[PDB]
CSV table of C-alpha atoms in Angstrom, one decimal:
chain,number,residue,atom,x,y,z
L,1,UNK,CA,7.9,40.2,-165.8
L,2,UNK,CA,4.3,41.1,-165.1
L,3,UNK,CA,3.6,40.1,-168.9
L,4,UNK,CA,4.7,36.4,-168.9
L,5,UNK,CA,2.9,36.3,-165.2
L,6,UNK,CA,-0.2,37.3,-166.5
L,7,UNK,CA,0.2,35.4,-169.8
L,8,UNK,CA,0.9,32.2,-167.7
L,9,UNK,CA,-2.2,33.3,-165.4
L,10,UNK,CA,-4.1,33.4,-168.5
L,11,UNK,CA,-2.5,30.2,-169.9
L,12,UNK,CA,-3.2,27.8,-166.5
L,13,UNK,CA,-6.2,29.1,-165.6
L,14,UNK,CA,-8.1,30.2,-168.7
L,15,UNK,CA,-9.1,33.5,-167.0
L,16,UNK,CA,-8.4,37.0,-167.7
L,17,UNK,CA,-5.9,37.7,-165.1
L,18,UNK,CA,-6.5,41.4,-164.3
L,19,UNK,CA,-10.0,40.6,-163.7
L,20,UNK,CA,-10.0,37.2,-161.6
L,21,UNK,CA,-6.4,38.4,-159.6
L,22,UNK,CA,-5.6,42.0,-160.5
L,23,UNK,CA,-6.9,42.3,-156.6
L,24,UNK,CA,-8.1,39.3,-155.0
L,25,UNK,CA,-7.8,38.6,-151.1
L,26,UNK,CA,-4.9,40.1,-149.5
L,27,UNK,CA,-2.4,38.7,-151.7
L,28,UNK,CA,-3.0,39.0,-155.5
L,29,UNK,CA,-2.3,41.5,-156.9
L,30,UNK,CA,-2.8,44.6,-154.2
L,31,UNK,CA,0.2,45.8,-152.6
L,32,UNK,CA,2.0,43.4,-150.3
L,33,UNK,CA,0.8,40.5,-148.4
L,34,UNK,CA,-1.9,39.6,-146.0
L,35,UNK,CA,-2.6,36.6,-144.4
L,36,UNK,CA,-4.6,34.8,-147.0
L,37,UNK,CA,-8.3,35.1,-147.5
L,38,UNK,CA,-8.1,31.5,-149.1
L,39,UNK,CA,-6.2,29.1,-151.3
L,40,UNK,CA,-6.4,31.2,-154.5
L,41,UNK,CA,-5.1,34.1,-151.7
L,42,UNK,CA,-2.9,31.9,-150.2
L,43,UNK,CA,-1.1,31.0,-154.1
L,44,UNK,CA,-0.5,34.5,-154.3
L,45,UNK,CA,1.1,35.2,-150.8
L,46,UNK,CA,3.5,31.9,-152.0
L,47,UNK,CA,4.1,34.0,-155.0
L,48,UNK,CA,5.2,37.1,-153.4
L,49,UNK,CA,7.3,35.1,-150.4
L,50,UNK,CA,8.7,33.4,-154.2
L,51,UNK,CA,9.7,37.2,-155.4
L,52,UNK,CA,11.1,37.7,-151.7
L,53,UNK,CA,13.4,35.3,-152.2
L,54,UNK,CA,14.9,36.4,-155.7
L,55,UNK,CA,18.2,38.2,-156.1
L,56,UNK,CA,19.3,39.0,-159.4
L,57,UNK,CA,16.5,40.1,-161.2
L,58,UNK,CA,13.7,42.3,-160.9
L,59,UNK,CA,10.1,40.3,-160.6
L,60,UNK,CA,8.3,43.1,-161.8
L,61,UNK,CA,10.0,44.1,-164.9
L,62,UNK,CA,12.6,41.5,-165.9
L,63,UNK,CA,11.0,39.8,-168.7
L,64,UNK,CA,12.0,36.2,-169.6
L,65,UNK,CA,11.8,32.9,-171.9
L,66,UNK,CA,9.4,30.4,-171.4
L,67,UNK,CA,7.4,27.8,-173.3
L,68,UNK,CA,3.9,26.1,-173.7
L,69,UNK,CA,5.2,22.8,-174.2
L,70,UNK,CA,2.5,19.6,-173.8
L,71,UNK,CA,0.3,22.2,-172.2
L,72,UNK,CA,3.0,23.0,-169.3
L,73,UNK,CA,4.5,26.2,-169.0
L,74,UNK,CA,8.4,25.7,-169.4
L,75,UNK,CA,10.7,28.0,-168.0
L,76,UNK,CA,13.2,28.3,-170.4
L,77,UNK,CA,16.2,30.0,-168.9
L,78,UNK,CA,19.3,29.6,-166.9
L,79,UNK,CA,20.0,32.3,-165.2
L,80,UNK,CA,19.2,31.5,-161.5
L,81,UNK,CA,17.1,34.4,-161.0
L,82,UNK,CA,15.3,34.2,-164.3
L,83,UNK,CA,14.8,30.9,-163.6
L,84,UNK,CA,13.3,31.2,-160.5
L,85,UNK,CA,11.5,34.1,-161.3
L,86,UNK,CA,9.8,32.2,-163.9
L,87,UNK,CA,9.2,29.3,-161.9
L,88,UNK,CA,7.9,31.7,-159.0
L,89,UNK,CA,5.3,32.8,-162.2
L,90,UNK,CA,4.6,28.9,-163.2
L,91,UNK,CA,3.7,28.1,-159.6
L,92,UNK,CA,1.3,30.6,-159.3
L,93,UNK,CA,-0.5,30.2,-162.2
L,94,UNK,CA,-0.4,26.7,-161.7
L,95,UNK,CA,-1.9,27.5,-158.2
L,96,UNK,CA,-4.1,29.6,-159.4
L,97,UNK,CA,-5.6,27.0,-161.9
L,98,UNK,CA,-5.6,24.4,-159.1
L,99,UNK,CA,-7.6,26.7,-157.0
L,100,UNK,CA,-10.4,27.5,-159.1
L,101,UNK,CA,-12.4,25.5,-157.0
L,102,UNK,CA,-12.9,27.8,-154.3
L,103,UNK,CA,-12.4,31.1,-156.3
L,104,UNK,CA,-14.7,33.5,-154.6
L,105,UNK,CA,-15.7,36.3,-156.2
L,106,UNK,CA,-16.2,38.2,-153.1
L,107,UNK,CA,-12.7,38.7,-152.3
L,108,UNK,CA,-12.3,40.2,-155.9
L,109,UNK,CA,-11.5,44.0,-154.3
L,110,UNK,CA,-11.2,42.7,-151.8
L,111,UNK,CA,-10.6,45.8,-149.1
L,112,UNK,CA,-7.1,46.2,-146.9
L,113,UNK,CA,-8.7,47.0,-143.8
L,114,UNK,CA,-10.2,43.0,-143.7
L,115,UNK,CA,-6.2,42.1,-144.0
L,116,UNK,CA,-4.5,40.8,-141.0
L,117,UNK,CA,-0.7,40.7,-140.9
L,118,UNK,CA,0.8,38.2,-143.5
L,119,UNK,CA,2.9,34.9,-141.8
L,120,UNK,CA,6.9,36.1,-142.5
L,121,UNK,CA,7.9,34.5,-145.8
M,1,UNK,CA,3.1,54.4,-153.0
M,2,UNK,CA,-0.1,52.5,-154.9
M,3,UNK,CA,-2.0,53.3,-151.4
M,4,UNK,CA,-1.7,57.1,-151.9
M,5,UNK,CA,-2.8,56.8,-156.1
M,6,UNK,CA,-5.5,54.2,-155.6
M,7,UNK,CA,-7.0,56.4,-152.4
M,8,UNK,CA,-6.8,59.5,-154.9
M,9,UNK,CA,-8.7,57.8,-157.5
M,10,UNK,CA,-11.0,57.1,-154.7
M,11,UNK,CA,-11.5,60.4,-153.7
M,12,UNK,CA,-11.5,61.9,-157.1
M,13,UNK,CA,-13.5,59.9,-159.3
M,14,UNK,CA,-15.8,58.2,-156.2
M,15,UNK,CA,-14.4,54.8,-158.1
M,16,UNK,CA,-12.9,51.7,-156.5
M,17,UNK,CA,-9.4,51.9,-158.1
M,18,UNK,CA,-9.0,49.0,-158.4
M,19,UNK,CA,-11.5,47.9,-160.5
M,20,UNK,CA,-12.2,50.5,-162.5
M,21,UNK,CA,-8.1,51.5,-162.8
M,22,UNK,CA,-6.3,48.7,-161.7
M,23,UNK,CA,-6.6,47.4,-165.6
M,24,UNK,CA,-8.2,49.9,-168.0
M,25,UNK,CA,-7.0,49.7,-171.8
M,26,UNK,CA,-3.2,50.2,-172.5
M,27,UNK,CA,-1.9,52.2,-169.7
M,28,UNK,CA,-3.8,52.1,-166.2
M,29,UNK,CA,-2.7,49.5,-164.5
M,30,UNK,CA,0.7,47.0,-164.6
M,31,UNK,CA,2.7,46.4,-168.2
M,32,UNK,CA,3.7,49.7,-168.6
M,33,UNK,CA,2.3,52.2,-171.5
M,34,UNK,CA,0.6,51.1,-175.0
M,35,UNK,CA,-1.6,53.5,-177.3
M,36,UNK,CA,-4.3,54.9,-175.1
M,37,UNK,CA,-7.8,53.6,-176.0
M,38,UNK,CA,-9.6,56.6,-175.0
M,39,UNK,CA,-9.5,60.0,-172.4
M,40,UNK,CA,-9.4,57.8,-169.6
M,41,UNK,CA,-6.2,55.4,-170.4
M,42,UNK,CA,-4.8,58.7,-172.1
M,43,UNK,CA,-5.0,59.9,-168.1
M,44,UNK,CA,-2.6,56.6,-167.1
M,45,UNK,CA,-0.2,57.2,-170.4
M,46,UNK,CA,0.2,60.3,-169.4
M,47,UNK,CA,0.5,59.4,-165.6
M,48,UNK,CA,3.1,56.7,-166.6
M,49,UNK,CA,5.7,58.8,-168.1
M,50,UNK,CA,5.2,61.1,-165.1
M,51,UNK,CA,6.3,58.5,-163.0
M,52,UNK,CA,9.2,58.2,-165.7
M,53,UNK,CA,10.2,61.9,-164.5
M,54,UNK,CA,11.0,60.6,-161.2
M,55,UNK,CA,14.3,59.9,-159.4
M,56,UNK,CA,14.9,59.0,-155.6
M,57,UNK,CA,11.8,57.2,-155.0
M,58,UNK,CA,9.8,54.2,-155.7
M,59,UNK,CA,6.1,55.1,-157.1
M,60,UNK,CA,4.6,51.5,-156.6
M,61,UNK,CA,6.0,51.2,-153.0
M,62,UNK,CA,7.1,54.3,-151.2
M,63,UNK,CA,4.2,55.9,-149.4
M,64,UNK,CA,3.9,59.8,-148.9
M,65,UNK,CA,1.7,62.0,-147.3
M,66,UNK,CA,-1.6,64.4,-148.9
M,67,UNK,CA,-4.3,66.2,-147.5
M,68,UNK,CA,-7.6,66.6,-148.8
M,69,UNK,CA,-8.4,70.4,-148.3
M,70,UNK,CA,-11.1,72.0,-149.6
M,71,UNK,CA,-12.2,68.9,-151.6
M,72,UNK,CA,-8.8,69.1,-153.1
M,73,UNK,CA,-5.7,66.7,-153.3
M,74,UNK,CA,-3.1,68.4,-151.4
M,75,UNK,CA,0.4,66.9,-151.4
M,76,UNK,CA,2.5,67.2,-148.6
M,77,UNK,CA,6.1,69.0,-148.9
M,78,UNK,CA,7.6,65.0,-148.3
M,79,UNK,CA,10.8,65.4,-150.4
M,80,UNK,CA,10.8,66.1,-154.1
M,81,UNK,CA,10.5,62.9,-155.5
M,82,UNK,CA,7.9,62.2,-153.6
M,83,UNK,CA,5.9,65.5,-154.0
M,84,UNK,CA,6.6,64.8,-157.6
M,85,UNK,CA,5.1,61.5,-157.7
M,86,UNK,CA,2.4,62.5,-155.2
M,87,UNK,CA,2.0,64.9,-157.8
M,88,UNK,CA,1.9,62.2,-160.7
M,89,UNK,CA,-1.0,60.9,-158.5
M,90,UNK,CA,-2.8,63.7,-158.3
M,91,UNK,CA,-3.1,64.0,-161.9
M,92,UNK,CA,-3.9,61.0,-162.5
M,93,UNK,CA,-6.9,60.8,-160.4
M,94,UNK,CA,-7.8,64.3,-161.1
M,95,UNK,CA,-7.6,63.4,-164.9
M,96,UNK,CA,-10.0,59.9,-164.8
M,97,UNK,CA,-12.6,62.1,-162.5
M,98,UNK,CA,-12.4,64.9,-165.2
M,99,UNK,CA,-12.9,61.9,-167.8
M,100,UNK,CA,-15.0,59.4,-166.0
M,101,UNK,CA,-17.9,60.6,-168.4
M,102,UNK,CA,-16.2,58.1,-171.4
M,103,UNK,CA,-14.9,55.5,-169.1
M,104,UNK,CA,-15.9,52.7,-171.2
M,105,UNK,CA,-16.2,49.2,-169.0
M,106,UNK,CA,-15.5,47.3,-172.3
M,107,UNK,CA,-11.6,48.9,-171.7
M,108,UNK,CA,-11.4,47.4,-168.2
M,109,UNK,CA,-8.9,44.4,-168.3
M,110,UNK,CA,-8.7,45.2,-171.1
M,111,UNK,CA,-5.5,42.8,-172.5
M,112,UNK,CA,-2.5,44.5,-172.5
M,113,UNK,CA,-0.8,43.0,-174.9
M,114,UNK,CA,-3.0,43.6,-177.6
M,115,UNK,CA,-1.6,47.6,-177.4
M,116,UNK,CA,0.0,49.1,-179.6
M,117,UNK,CA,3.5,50.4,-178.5
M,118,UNK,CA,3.1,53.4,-177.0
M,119,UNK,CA,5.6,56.4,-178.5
M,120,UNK,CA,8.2,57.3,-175.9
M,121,UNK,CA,6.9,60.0,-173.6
């Protein structure tokens, strides 16, 4: 669920997730997807084509089991969907750490109308 | 749908929703309700269990259709979930303009799980 995302957000990236993604680009955290304003962006679009792909389980409010084990976020279920969605959640806090880099701050609120049309997932 | 409440709390409190609502204390934002910090999350507890009211449609994702008449959030006739959730919206954002006065900025992004459970609405 949104919980563990934003506790793994938290977890990869050291960052208070509503602040740094709660609405960056076109991707985090506002509705839908947009073609990316950058790789932080970009993680979040993968996260949402991630979601896409889940049947089973609802991404939003299906909270599940996971671990900080050697500093890694472990899934720890086995339910397909679970599973996935909680890898769906590791990858994009891990992309989201990994990303950093070129974090811009100017995408935080980033507005709609600067969206162009995502890629399909 | 989040377009229709975040252009709301646009045009009611003269905020970007998402930064100053997107977040705020226990109940504005994602990860459901917790006990409200102040007036302003009391406005997003209050919202959220309006939204609880509501069968046949989607608040997060189905779209409907206001007016803004006479300075005034008018929502369309839609269908009655949706006038009911346009309704939800309209409280909402009527409810953080009639409390922006407290809006505290220590309560945005504000961590969510550090809430107290909120009491069933």
């Amino acid at each position: 669920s949104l919980f563990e995302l934003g506790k793994m957000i938290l977890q990869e990236t050291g960052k208070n997730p509503a602040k740094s993604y709660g609405a960056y680009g076109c991707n985090c955290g506002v509705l839908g997807r947009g073609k990316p304003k950058d790789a932080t962006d970009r993680c979040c679009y993968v996260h949402k084509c991630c979601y896409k792909k889940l049947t089973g389980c609802n991404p939003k409010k299906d909270r599940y089991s996971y671990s900080w084990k050697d500093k890694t976020i472990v899934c720890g279920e086995n339910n397909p969907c679970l599973k996935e969605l909680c890898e769906c959640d590791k990858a994009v806090a891990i992309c989201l750490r990994e990303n950093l880099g070129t974090y811009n701050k100017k995408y935080r609120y980033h507005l709609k109308p600067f969206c162009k049309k995502a890629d399909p997932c």
